[PDB]
Structure formats: C-alpha cells, structure tokens
DNA sequence: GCTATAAATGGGCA
DNA sequence: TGCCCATTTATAGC
C-alpha cells in the first residue's frame, strides 16, 4: 500500500453541501453567535465550530463550503453540525449532494532535495522560481495532483478528491525525490 | 504576516 | 465573460 513506508498526513478537507433552501444571511448573522457576516467583503456568513475544528461559508442560495477538517468523515460530520444549527435557526435545511472537493496532505521524506535538478529534468511538470516562492511546483498528470516540494524534504500534496490520489501522487514522486536527493 | 497551491462558494465590476 | 472577493491547511523564505 505505501511502498515508501511513509503515509501522507491529511491536513485540510474542503467539502460542499446543498442545504436546498434559500437562507436569510442577515437573520443568521444576528441569531447565530458563532458567525460573522460582512457582505461588502464576502457574500457569505462565516461560521465556526470547535469539534471538528472547522469553518463553514454559508450562502443565501443554501450552498455551503466546509474547510479545515482533518479527514473526510470529520468534514461531513462538521457539515452536518452546521446544517443542524441552520435548521435550528428556523430554516428547512437538508443535506443534499455532500461532496469532498479537496484534500490537502503533507509528509516528510527526511532527506534534502536538489530542486533545481528536479525542475530541470521535469520541466514539463515543474515551476521552480525560488525568488518568488521557495517550493517547487510539480503538477502531476496522473493523478492530476499538485505537489509542493521543498529543499527540506517536506512535501505538500493537494488537489485530491479521493485520499488514494494523495497516496498515489506521493508514491509516484518518491522515486523522483530520491533521484534528486541532495548530497 | 506576505509570496504559491488546490478546491468549492458569490457579489461586484471592467 | 472572467477575475478577485474570503476561507482552510501544510510548507519556507522575505
């Protein structure tokens, strides 16, 4: 399953769900305490809960974004809590089309990387402009996953909708990181 | 904190 | 017609 012997740690999950009922954001921001609505800046009510530690963006359309959870289950669970709070506030909220939209993972290969050599050998996939951002941007095609590679050996993997894509992206890159280990 | 990465949502605006 | 708007999270160097 994880030939490298390293398993990327899931750090952030963004999911979305349709409450399937229009919402009065101004009424939600007044009644709810764990909220903050400033439409001139963003069209959403920003709500937060302690467990699972997450943040929700609630829109008048009934659409909702859930960010911050450390697992897919935690995300859905948190999304359900927001929906219940909305329901309790007075709206006929449902839990329609729950979908995991992005999973962010990270791991440490515990060895330094020669980013410039890696970038040069994989120019079709890399973007390494150290003066702007210190990490190399590797946009993997299969699976379609973006990996941020640092000299420290620390790797961030994002864009996955299924955790196995995160795991696969890593396993695919491992041999490449090894080939360019900084000695 | 800013730089960069992915993803979803929306109001505004050239 | 597209783009930033704000939110989250790991990462590291101004």
Q: Which two tokens stand for residue A2?
A: 């994880």
* A3 within 8 A of A61, measured Cβ to Cβ: no
- CB-count burial class (<10 Å; 0-12, 13-18, 19+) for A13: buried
Instruction: For residues A73 and A148, give the distance between their C-alpha atoms in angstroms, rounded to a whole number.
Output: 25
Q: DSSP secondary structure string, A53-79? A: TEEEEE-TTSEEEEEEESSHHHHHHHH
- Residue-number span of the structural domain to which A45 is assigned: 15-100
What is the total count of domains within chain A? 2
Helices (H), A24-160: 25-31, 72-89, 115-121
Which technique was used to obtain these atomic coordinates? X-ray
Nucleotide nearest A18, CA–C1', reads B9
Q: Which two tokens stand for residue A181?
A: 């280990």
Number of C-beta neighbours around residue A69 at 10 A? 25
A84, A27: one domain:
yes
* Separation in Å: C10 C1' and A119 CA: 21
A80, A148: one domain:
no
Q: C-alpha A157: how far from its chain's center?
A: 9
Cα distances (Å, whole numbers) of residue A77 to A53, A80, A173 = 11, 5, 32
A82, A134: one domain:
no
* Separation in Å: B9 C1' and A142 CA: 27
State which of A83, A100, A117 marks the end of a domain. A100
Q: Which two tokens stand for residue A101?
A: 């939209």
The CATH number assigned to the domain holding A153 equals 3.30.310.10
- Which of A87, A61, A89, A74 has the alpha carbon at shortest distance from A15? A74
Q: Which residues contact A49 (CB under 8 A, 6 or more apart)?
A: A34, A56, A78, A81, A82
Q: Which resolution, in Å, applies to this structure?
A: 2.2
Q: How much of chain A is helix, strand and coil, in % rounded to 5?
A: 25, 35, 40
């Amino acid at each position: 399953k994880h030939p490298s012997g390293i398993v990327p740690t899931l750090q952030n999950i963004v999911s979305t769900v349709n409450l399937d009922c229009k919402l009065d954001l101004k009424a939600i921001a007044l009644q709810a305490r764990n909220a903050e609505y400033n439409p001139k800046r963003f069209a959403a009510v920003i709500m937060r809960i302690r467990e699972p530690k997450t943040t929700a963006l609630i829109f008048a359309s009934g659409k909702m974004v859930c960010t911050g959870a450390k697992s897919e289950d935690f995300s859905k669970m948190a999304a359900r809590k927001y929906a219940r709070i909305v329901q309790k506030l007075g709206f006929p909220a449902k839990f329609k089309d729950f979908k995991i939209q992005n999973i962010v993972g990270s791991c440490d290969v515990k060895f330094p990387i020669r980013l410039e050599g890696l970038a040069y050998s994989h120019a079709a996939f890399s973007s390494y402009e150290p003066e702007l951002f210190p990490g190399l941007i590797y946009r993997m095609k299969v699976p379609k996953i973006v990996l941020l590679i640092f000299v420290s050996g620390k790797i961030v993997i994002t864009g996955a909708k299924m955790r196995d894509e995160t795991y696969k992206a890593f396993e695919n890159i491992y041999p490449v990181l090894s080939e360019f280990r900084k000695i």
